[PDB]
Design a protein around this motif. Structure first.
Motif, PDB file in Angstrom:
ATOM      1  N   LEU B  91       0.567  -1.027   0.047  1.00 54.90           N
ATOM      2  CA  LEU B  91       0.135  -0.315   0.211  1.00 54.90           C
ATOM      3  C   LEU B  91       1.021   1.159  -0.020  1.00 54.90           C
ATOM      4  O   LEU B  91       0.608   2.634  -0.036  1.00 54.90           O
ATOM      5  CB  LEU B  91      -0.683   0.162   1.216  1.00 54.90           C
ATOM      6  CG  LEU B  91      -1.936  -0.854   0.729  1.00 54.90           C
ATOM      7  CD1 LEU B  91      -1.922  -2.205   1.707  1.00 54.90           C
ATOM      8  CD2 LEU B  91      -3.179  -1.051  -0.024  1.00 54.90           C
ATOM      9  N   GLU B  92       2.151   1.293   0.379  1.00 56.23           N
ATOM     10  CA  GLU B  92       2.615   2.159   0.402  1.00 56.23           C
ATOM     11  C   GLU B  92       3.425   2.631  -0.897  1.00 56.23           C
ATOM     12  O   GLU B  92       3.752   3.747  -1.107  1.00 56.23           O
ATOM     13  CB  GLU B  92       3.955   2.213   1.516  1.00 56.23           C
ATOM     14  CG  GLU B  92       3.634   3.179   2.666  1.00 56.23           C
ATOM     15  CD  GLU B  92       3.670   4.735   2.019  1.00 56.23           C
ATOM     16  OE1 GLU B  92       3.353   5.135   2.595  1.00 56.23           O
ATOM     17  OE2 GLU B  92       4.244   5.305   0.984  1.00 56.23           O
ATOM     18  N   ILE B  94       2.506   1.880  -3.601  1.00 52.83           N
ATOM     19  CA  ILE B  94       0.914   2.351  -3.789  1.00 52.83           C
ATOM     20  C   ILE B  94       0.719   3.583  -4.103  1.00 52.83           C
ATOM     21  O   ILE B  94       0.876   4.793  -4.776  1.00 52.83           O
ATOM     22  CB  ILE B  94      -0.173   1.735  -3.525  1.00 52.83           C
ATOM     23  CG1 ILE B  94      -0.545   0.143  -3.382  1.00 52.83           C
ATOM     24  CG2 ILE B  94      -1.768   2.646  -4.135  1.00 52.83           C
ATOM     25  CD1 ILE B  94      -1.301  -0.078  -2.848  1.00 52.83           C
ATOM     26  N   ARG B  95       0.977   4.173  -2.695  1.00 54.44           N
ATOM     27  CA  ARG B  95       0.929   5.682  -2.377  1.00 54.44           C
ATOM     28  C   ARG B  95       1.853   6.600  -3.290  1.00 54.44           C
ATOM     29  O   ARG B  95       1.493   7.637  -4.020  1.00 54.44           O
ATOM     30  CB  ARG B  95       0.549   5.979  -0.676  1.00 54.44           C
ATOM     31  CG  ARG B  95       0.332   7.487  -0.973  1.00 54.44           C
ATOM     32  CD  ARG B  95       2.294   8.844  -0.508  1.00 54.44           C
ATOM     33  NE  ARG B  95       2.664  10.250   0.290  1.00 54.44           N
ATOM     34  CZ  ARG B  95       1.426  10.615  -0.580  1.00 54.44           C
ATOM     35  NH1 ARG B  95       1.122  10.886  -2.020  1.00 54.44           N
ATOM     36  NH2 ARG B  95       1.221  11.964  -0.085  1.00 54.44           N
ATOM     37  N   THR B  98       0.571   6.279  -6.734  1.00 60.33           N
ATOM     38  CA  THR B  98      -1.329   6.373  -7.586  1.00 60.33           C
ATOM     39  C   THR B  98      -0.854   8.096  -6.877  1.00 60.33           C
ATOM     40  O   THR B  98      -1.807   9.052  -7.251  1.00 60.33           O
ATOM     41  CB  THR B  98      -1.967   6.029  -6.552  1.00 60.33           C
ATOM     42  OG1 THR B  98      -1.264   6.113  -5.395  1.00 60.33           O
ATOM     43  CG2 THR B  98      -1.798   4.048  -6.256  1.00 60.33           C
ATOM     44  N   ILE B 100      -2.104  10.148  -4.291  1.00 59.04           N
ATOM     45  CA  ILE B 100      -3.197  10.201  -3.592  1.00 59.04           C
ATOM     46  C   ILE B 100      -3.871   8.825  -3.681  1.00 59.04           C
ATOM     47  O   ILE B 100      -4.431   8.031  -2.912  1.00 59.04           O
ATOM     48  CB  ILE B 100      -3.937  11.645  -3.837  1.00 59.04           C
ATOM     49  CG1 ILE B 100      -3.026  12.998  -4.158  1.00 59.04           C
ATOM     50  CG2 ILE B 100      -5.231  12.125  -2.770  1.00 59.04           C
ATOM     51  CD1 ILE B 100      -2.186  12.908  -3.419  1.00 59.04           C
ATOM     52  N   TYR B 101      -4.920   9.264  -4.877  1.00 60.21           N
ATOM     53  CA  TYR B 101      -6.409   7.855  -5.110  1.00 60.21           C
ATOM     54  C   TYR B 101      -5.737   6.425  -5.651  1.00 60.21           C
ATOM     55  O   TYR B 101      -4.229   6.304  -5.312  1.00 60.21           O
ATOM     56  CB  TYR B 101      -6.913   7.954  -5.503  1.00 60.21           C
ATOM     57  CG  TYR B 101      -8.020   9.244  -5.753  1.00 60.21           C
ATOM     58  CD1 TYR B 101      -8.131  10.337  -5.449  1.00 60.21           C
ATOM     59  CD2 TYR B 101      -9.508   8.840  -5.775  1.00 60.21           C
ATOM     60  CE1 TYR B 101      -8.758  11.857  -5.374  1.00 60.21           C
ATOM     61  CE2 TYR B 101     -10.254   9.982  -5.740  1.00 60.21           C
ATOM     62  CZ  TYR B 101     -10.315  11.220  -5.647  1.00 60.21           C
ATOM     63  OH  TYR B 101     -11.278  12.631  -5.120  1.00 60.21           O
ATOM     64  N   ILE B 102      -6.609   5.610  -5.560  1.00 56.54           N
ATOM     65  CA  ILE B 102      -5.967   4.192  -5.592  1.00 56.54           C
ATOM     66  C   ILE B 102      -6.448   3.656  -6.871  1.00 56.54           C
ATOM     67  O   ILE B 102      -7.909   3.647  -7.532  1.00 56.54           O
ATOM     68  CB  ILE B 102      -6.965   3.140  -5.243  1.00 56.54           C
ATOM     69  CG1 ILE B 102      -6.451   3.006  -3.151  1.00 56.54           C
ATOM     70  CG2 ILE B 102      -6.940   1.868  -5.267  1.00 56.54           C
ATOM     71  CD1 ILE B 102      -7.501   2.550  -2.252  1.00 56.54           C
ATOM     72  N   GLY B 259     -13.097   1.654   7.247  1.00 55.48           N
ATOM     73  CA  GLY B 259     -11.915   2.743   6.711  1.00 55.48           C
ATOM     74  C   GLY B 259     -11.391   3.253   7.736  1.00 55.48           C
ATOM     75  O   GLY B 259     -10.392   3.305   7.904  1.00 55.48           O
ATOM     76  N   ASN B 260     -11.878   4.067   8.512  1.00 58.39           N
ATOM     77  CA  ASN B 260     -11.172   5.366   9.568  1.00 58.39           C
ATOM     78  C   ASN B 260     -10.170   4.441  10.594  1.00 58.39           C
ATOM     79  O   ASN B 260      -9.362   4.531  11.114  1.00 58.39           O
ATOM     80  CB  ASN B 260     -11.447   6.236   9.843  1.00 58.39           C
ATOM     81  CG  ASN B 260     -12.462   7.061   8.659  1.00 58.39           C
ATOM     82  OD1 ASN B 260     -12.359   8.350   8.414  1.00 58.39           O
ATOM     83  ND2 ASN B 260     -12.656   6.677   7.545  1.00 58.39           N
ATOM     84  N   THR B 263      -7.581   1.990  10.441  1.00 59.98           N
ATOM     85  CA  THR B 263      -6.413   3.463   9.989  1.00 59.98           C
ATOM     86  C   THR B 263      -5.669   3.532  11.168  1.00 59.98           C
ATOM     87  O   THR B 263      -4.436   3.948  11.460  1.00 59.98           O
ATOM     88  CB  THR B 263      -6.680   4.249   9.522  1.00 59.98           C
ATOM     89  OG1 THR B 263      -5.982   4.067   8.143  1.00 59.98           O
ATOM     90  CG2 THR B 263      -5.493   5.195   9.389  1.00 59.98           C
ATOM     91  N   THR B 291      -9.329  -2.582   4.574  1.00 56.82           N
ATOM     92  CA  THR B 291     -10.124  -1.406   4.975  1.00 56.82           C
ATOM     93  C   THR B 291     -11.222  -2.586   4.675  1.00 56.82           C
ATOM     94  O   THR B 291     -11.079  -3.761   3.691  1.00 56.82           O
ATOM     95  CB  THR B 291     -10.205  -0.099   4.077  1.00 56.82           C
ATOM     96  OG1 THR B 291      -9.094   0.178   3.839  1.00 56.82           O
ATOM     97  CG2 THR B 291     -10.970   1.037   4.584  1.00 56.82           C
ATOM     98  N   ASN B 293     -14.004  -1.420   2.337  1.00 60.03           N
ATOM     99  CA  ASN B 293     -14.765  -1.857   0.756  1.00 60.03           C
ATOM    100  C   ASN B 293     -13.566  -2.491   0.238  1.00 60.03           C
ATOM    101  O   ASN B 293     -13.662  -1.964  -0.647  1.00 60.03           O
ATOM    102  CB  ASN B 293     -14.677  -0.166   0.866  1.00 60.03           C
ATOM    103  CG  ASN B 293     -13.782   0.778   1.193  1.00 60.03           C
ATOM    104  OD1 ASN B 293     -13.669   0.471   2.423  1.00 60.03           O
ATOM    105  ND2 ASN B 293     -13.518   1.457   0.440  1.00 60.03           N
ATOM    106  N   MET B 294     -12.665  -2.664   0.617  1.00 57.29           N
ATOM    107  CA  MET B 294     -11.597  -3.567  -0.185  1.00 57.29           C
ATOM    108  C   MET B 294     -12.301  -4.044  -1.009  1.00 57.29           C
ATOM    109  O   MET B 294     -13.407  -5.010  -1.030  1.00 57.29           O
ATOM    110  CB  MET B 294     -10.072  -3.810   0.230  1.00 57.29           C
ATOM    111  CG  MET B 294      -9.739  -2.756   1.691  1.00 57.29           C
ATOM    112  SD  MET B 294      -9.397  -0.491   0.139  1.00 57.29           S
ATOM    113  CE  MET B 294     -10.970  -0.100   0.885  1.00 57.29           C
TER     114      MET B 294
END
Lengths: 457, 577, 52, 457
Positions: B91-92, B94-95, B98, B100-102, B259-260, B263, B291, B293-294
């Protein structure tokens, strides 16, 4: 743009040579009269494809059925030029004003952002209320659910505090430079009556002059209905997330979210697992409470708010379960509360923002709020005991110390909770608590510290 | 690398021909943009593909490309401190790509060759190999990663690249039969990493958490589980767990998490206070959080992730320790996946799968041996916590089906602000049984006899509080109260171990032991006092006993010295009546 | 009453729920059984339409 | 060998040209890697034959992967060397010890002997456990359903009597000439501890030097769980009747048997009928115990001791329910005994065997056993009955009519039932079994005569 349509069910329509199309698309279909309608692009197999007419159905013929290719995925135009615009379901110009200036035709579903970016929403926020700001506030980006009743003063209490809300960075030590106020509201399955009660609040006082509408009546077409929310939903993003503004997403009776759903599977063959509903709601629904939060580096944060009613106020249903699983809180409304006249009729402990317990107190809102927030909670409910026990002994049949814990409850629901349309500033709202606490001589509250009470009290 | 062409497009599910003879469930990269998929029930020259990714904008006959190779994990050093997701995507990395977004259908290797490793060729060319054996080591963060050969490997070695800087990709060695071999590898989640022998779960596991292990522990690599509402700083336990835990290896598979809420952990996680290296424990840690919703199977592979992987390091003789909060929701995905398939949610509205993958899900635990023959901690914790405070439910009464230890938390016991507020009348651990032996063996011959002994609290408390909860210190003879009086200290001093503070946070058996003791040696005489003639509401005002409440808070080092005086302090602090 | 409540009341209404439940959850029998047969038809029709 | 592969499903899949192959035979399939597995030959229709997927529905492919007819039906050999050997899963001496070659290779399914040559049990299973042999025991030829629970003392209990069980002919009739207590064992979805647990119970008694050790791994081939069953069975058949050895084999935690077995018909489209369970559940339970019993004149006496935990703890479930009819009788532990301190933690509520009647009482054992059978029954029962209303009105609100049945509930409690690993024989057991009825007068009882009541009062 082909023809020869075989297999037609309601607002559905099949068409061969579907190798140019692709699930996730939509185009306008024309029968004989050449009437322009629509239809989503599903099952684009070799033989035939699957389309879903915008309207109900009547208007499909055997002879002609050509179709004008609109665009695999359509998306309304985004921009900051929408501070009072108005749209329904799909979200098309009905407010009279010029078609919204399209900035970027982003997919109505940009899916969640990098989970690594997401941060804990803790920017305190007022709503012009006491009880719904003191015992349970709402942090920026915090997705807070609202268990309403399917026929309760919901529709009202909804849009009531809607406008009341007001972001206050000032008290934290900042201005409204990067913290703008953006109000977005989107309903569905609304009565012709209600569809009119809404439009009212905005026109009230500087409400619509900073917001956009969206709501697909239940009598309208069932297609835009589902996506209806995703529209301004995906759009709020460009606001706080793209420019760093501050948006507020507020759902409305997901009754639609599911009723409408049933059709998708009921036709798509999507077998309904539990409770006679699609075995993939959690997922599809998840993508919802995901459009809210915060990223590393951006102050701009949109706050998310779900709001629905159960079938018979059963939390065993999806409408509640789902939420009560992803949502970070809980806020219901009881028949009791409202029956006596309490308005807003909102229970105590049953309602509470899970993540508004950290974004309050020192620095945030009222330092002593820290313990103030957990005071009136355990202290208040404590009285709700000598509240149904009258018939046992009586009024004076009870001790003074505990009997006193009574008068509080009544002065608490009638005045403290029932606040109607009133708008109590985040600060005018905290005071009240104190005031009520005076019932018990300074020294009976075991929740807050002697330090804070020995002062504000 | 099996390729193909799309035939149909049904929203999420897909079908494509031109590919025949491919295995079941594999790579499945349909969509021009090589999307996320899975091979299923085949038919004739085509098979079924399940596409989770947004199935929007899909033209029949697209770049239908699979590998006919199961979804497996990228073995090899690195992963530690490394960031990954549901399946195994950093996921990093990735950041950074990407921004910001996915982005969808995107991909980045778990360990870009950009990483330069410095192994050491502890082998020789022309030597004997055994299904994955000795190989070479790398200076990983704090610990020297032992890079060993995977299975099927039996025979001759050829060419051995001596020391030097080389990435996980650099084929260090090769076999005198072909192929080569590097630092990292690739292994299917569905399968476990056989070591040789599981052995007898005799070696006791000191999770360092008082109530946890002193009461009920787990040899090492056992299998546990706990309730708790949804959230409630539930993360507390699992966190402190690795901190103290006697496992060098930290896994963690947050799955389908709010979600949050998915995190808060993530942000507070980095903040390690490692008690061994004295600093960021981040060194011996693995991240995977996913997450809710993944992606469809995202959350479903999540678990499998840490577990499968745990095996890699474990197999090397490492003390792996996987958890993953929000596991209970984990199943969520399983329903979603098995839902869309001809499957009637058996038992309680849910796929029949239970003693299914869940069962075996644990069998990958205990006293694993190693490829090279060594002990490896593979403790599993079912961070399974229903968000609705349920007692009977699939997730639960199933887990119970098979586990080893149960650490029930009570919502009330906590609602009071009690930490730990682990509700015991509702907790258990079968391990103790066979671990008791070693207990007195290594610790103290009389150690167990104390724990099992004091336990009477509950015994003479369960049915004591009951009626006496309301009535209280009243029609009671006298010894009546003394019984619940002690519980008070045992539950407000001994029981409660505010894992939050640094003082009583960390602790070892021989520490807690004195504690429980100090309350015992004071009890064997305390009851002999009111029975001989001494006051009840008097004994209870002795500051000597209050020094006990802190025994837990006492430093593990002064505890002994603090014991010498304190203990004997009783013998004389009691001689007054 | 406490006692009773506790063994007839409490347990009286407990035991109710189970019976209901198990019938309620399985009730989704028709869901699978009805739909199972449903696929065969929708597809048999589209399965025999590609063979005729 | 035939490569007829045109359809593929998680279970079996389309296979033609194999229509001449035996039906429901043992076939092997190489994933086209070399990897090969088995399955059964069900629905060998010319229309399209289908094959039983063992495990990992994956790896299989349309190109490679072909089948191999090995045997027409369930078969494998059984020699005498099999004493104290271990063949986990499908019966393979995986352990570590070289899989010896079987003396005689025969089928495993097999079908019950002739209901005509089935003798009636006389001998009595005498175990160092009163609790059992008192109320309800066995003739070493009747199967009784033992219900435990998830994480419940099922091992300890079945263990206790495991070796602590002996046979007494002196009172029965037969002598000690041909009695081999040889007992194999089959692991049906066993677990970590529960598996490694019965390990020593043999290595300690030597039971591992004369038994076969079938296991399931609980993760090995799901189908395997339904294989070791019919295999384990015939096992006894060889040594039991053929060699006249009373060979008694008791499988383990048969829970994972139903457990897994039920999921079979799942995608197998079996259309369950019962509670979410296969509409043919009982259908399989047929060969289950339908193979247990005793033979006329033949010294072979096999009898499986069902020991498996029920769901949560309710017999409502067919798991135990279907067990009731099939199995003779029904015994449980009520999880109340052990959870409290009673060991053996067995409860008299459902306990009561179907073959306990013929072969007990007089001759076979103490003649007053048959009489005191029921006496205890109505005595203890109404015992607790009392303790019920006690906390309901006050420990005091009763008369001599209760103060006596009361103490009858304690004495029977941990006093009689519990005892630990104690090895109480049928003698020691009953001898004092009366010391409990010492208080109860000969009038308050009417179950036994007036002669046996004064026998050992």
């Amino acid at each position: 743009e082909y023809t020869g349509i075989t297999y037609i069910s309601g607002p559905l329509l099949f068409v061969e040579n579907a190798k140019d199309l692709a699930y996730g698309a939509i185009v306008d279909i024309k029968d004989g009269t050449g009437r322009v309608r629509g239809g989503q692009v599903i099952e684009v197999s070799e033989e035939y494809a699957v389309i879903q007419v915008f309207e109900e159905t009547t208007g499909l013929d055997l002879a002609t059925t050509s179709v004008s290719l609109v665009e695999d995925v359509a998306r309304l135009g985004v921009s900051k030029e929408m501070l009072g615009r108005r749209f329904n379901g799909i979200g098309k110009p009905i407010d009279g004003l010029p078609p919204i200036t399209p900035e970027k035709r982003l997919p109505i579903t940009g899916l969640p952002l990098n989970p690594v970016a997401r941060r804990k929403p803790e920017q305190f926020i007022q709503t012009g209320i006491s009880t719904i700001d003191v015992m349970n506030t709402l942090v920026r980006g915090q997705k807070l659910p609202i268990f309403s009743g399917s026929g309760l003063p919901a529709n009202e209490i909804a849009a009531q505090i809607a406008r009341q809300a007001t972001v206050r960075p000032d008290l934290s030590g900042e201005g409204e430079k990067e913290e703008p106020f953006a109000v977005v509201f989107a309903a569905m399955g609304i009565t012709q009556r209600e569809l009119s009660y809404f439009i009212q609040e905005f026109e009230r006082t500087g409400a619509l002059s900073r917001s956009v509408l969206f709501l697909n009546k239940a009598d309208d077409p069932t297609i835009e209905r589902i996506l209806t929310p995703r529209m301004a939903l995906t759009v709020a993003e460009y606001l706080a997330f793209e420019h760093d503004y501050h948006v507020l997403v507020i759902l409305t009776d997901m009754t639609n979210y599911c009723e409408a759903l049933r059709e998708i599977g009921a036709a798509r063959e999507e077998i309904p697992g539990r409770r006679g509903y699609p075995g993939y709601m959690y997922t599809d629904l998840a993508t919802i409470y995901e459009r809210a939060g915060v990223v590393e580096g951006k102050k701009g944060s949109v706050t998310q708010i779900p709001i629905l009613s159960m079938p018979d106020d059963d939390r065993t249903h999806p409408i509640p379960d789902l939420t009560g699983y992803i949502t970070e809180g809980q806020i219901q409304l009881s028949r009791e509360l409202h029956r006596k006249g309490i308005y807003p009729p909102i229970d105590p402990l049953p309602s509470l923002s899970r993540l508004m317990n950290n974004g309050v107190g020192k620095g945030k809102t009222r330092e002593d709020h820290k313990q103030v927030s957990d005071q009136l909670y355990s202290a208040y409910a404590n009285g709700v005991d000598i509240r149904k026990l009258v018939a046992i002994i009586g009024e004076d049949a009870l001790t003074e110390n505990d009997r006193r814990y009574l008068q509080f409850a009544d002065a608490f629901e009638r005045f403290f909770i029932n606040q109607g349309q009133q708008n109590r500033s985040i600060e005018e709202s905290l005071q009240i608590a104190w005031a009520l606490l005076s019932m018990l001589p300074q020294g009976e509250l075991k929740r807050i510290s002697k330090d804070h009470i020995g002062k504000y009290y | 690398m099996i390729q193909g062409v799309i035939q149909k497009i049904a929203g999420p599910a897909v079908i494509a021909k031109g590919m025949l003879g491919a295995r079941m469930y594999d790579i499945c990269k349909v969509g021009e943009e090589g999307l996320v998929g899975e091979i299923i029930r085949l038919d004739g020259d085509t098979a079924f593909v399940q596409v989770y990714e947004d199935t929007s904008g899909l033209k029949v006959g697209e770049p239908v490309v699979s590998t006919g190779l199961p979804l497996a994990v990228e073995l090899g050093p690195g992963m530690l401190n490394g960031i990954y997701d549901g399946i195994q995507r950093p996921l990093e990395r990735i950041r950074e790509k990407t921004g910001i977004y996915i982005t969808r259908g995107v991909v980045v290797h778990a360990l870009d060759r950009e990483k330069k490793w410095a192994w050491t060729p502890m082998v020789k060319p022309g030597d004997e190999v055994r299904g994955g054996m000795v190989l070479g080591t790398v200076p990983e963060f704090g610990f020297t990663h032992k890079i060993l050969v995977p299975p099927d490997v039996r025979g001759r070695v050829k060419e051995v690249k001596p020391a030097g800087e080389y990435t996980v990709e650099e084929p260090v060695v090769v076999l005198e039969d072909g192929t080569e071999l590097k630092m990292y590898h690739t292994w299917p989640v569905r399968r476990a990493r056989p070591v040789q022998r599981k052995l007898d779960p005799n070696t006791p596991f000191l999770t360092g958490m008082r109530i946890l292990d002193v009461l009920f522990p787990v040899a090492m690599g056992g299998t546990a589980a706990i309730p708790g509402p949804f959230g409630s700083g539930k993360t507390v336990t699992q966190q402190s767990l690795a901190k103290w835990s006697n496992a060098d290896v930290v896994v963690y598979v947050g799955c389908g998490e709010r979600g949050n809420e998915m995190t808060d952990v993530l942000v507070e996680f980095p903040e390690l206070t490692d008690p061994k290296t004295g600093g960021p424990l981040m060194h011996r840690t693995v991240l995977i959080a996913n997450t809710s919703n993944m992606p469809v199977a995202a959350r479903e592979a999540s678990i499998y992730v840490g577990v499968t992987i745990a095996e890699y390091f474990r197999d090397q003789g490492f003390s792996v320790a996987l958890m993953a909060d929000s596991t209970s929701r984990w199943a969520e995905a399983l329903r979603e996946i098995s839902s869309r398939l001809e499957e009637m949610p058996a038992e309680e509205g849910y796929p029949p799968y239970l003693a299914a993958r869940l069962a075996a899900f644990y069998e990958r635990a205990g006293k694993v041996i190693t490829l090279g023959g060594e002990e490896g901690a593979v403790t599993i914790v079912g961070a399974v916590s229903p968000p609705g405070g349920d007692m009977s439910e699939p997730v639960t009464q199933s887990t119970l089906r098979i586990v080893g230890a149960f650490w029930r938390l009570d919502a009330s016991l906590a609602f009071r602000r009690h930490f730990p507020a682990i509700n015991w009348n509702g907790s258990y651990s079968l391990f103790t049984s066979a671990l008791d032996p070693w207990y007195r063996e290594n610790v103290a011959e009389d150690y167990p006899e104390l724990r099992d002994a004091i336990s009477e609290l509950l015994q003479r408390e369960a049915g004591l509080q009951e009626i006496v909860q309301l009535v209280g210190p009243d029609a009671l003879q006298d010894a009546e109260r003394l019984v619940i009086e002690v519980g008070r200290i045992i539950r407000e001093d001994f029981l409660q171990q505010n894992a939050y503070h640094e003082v009583d946070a960390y602790c070892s058996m021989k520490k807690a032991y004195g504690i429980m003791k100090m309350i015992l040696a004071f009890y064997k005489e305390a009851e002999a006092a009111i029975k001989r003639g001494v006051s009840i509401d008097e004994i209870l005002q002795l500051p000597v006993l209050e020094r006990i409440g802190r025994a837990r808070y006492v430093s593990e080092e002064e505890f002994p010295a603090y014991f010498e005086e304190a203990m004997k302090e009783i013998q004389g602090a009691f001689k007054a009546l | 009453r406490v006692n009773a409540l506790e063994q007839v009341v409490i347990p009286g209404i407990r035991a109710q729920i189970r019976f209901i439940q198990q019938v309620l959850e399985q009730r989704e029998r028709e869901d699978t059984f009805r739909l199972k047969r449903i696929k065969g038809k929708i597809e048999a029709r589209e399965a025999e339409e590609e063979g005729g």
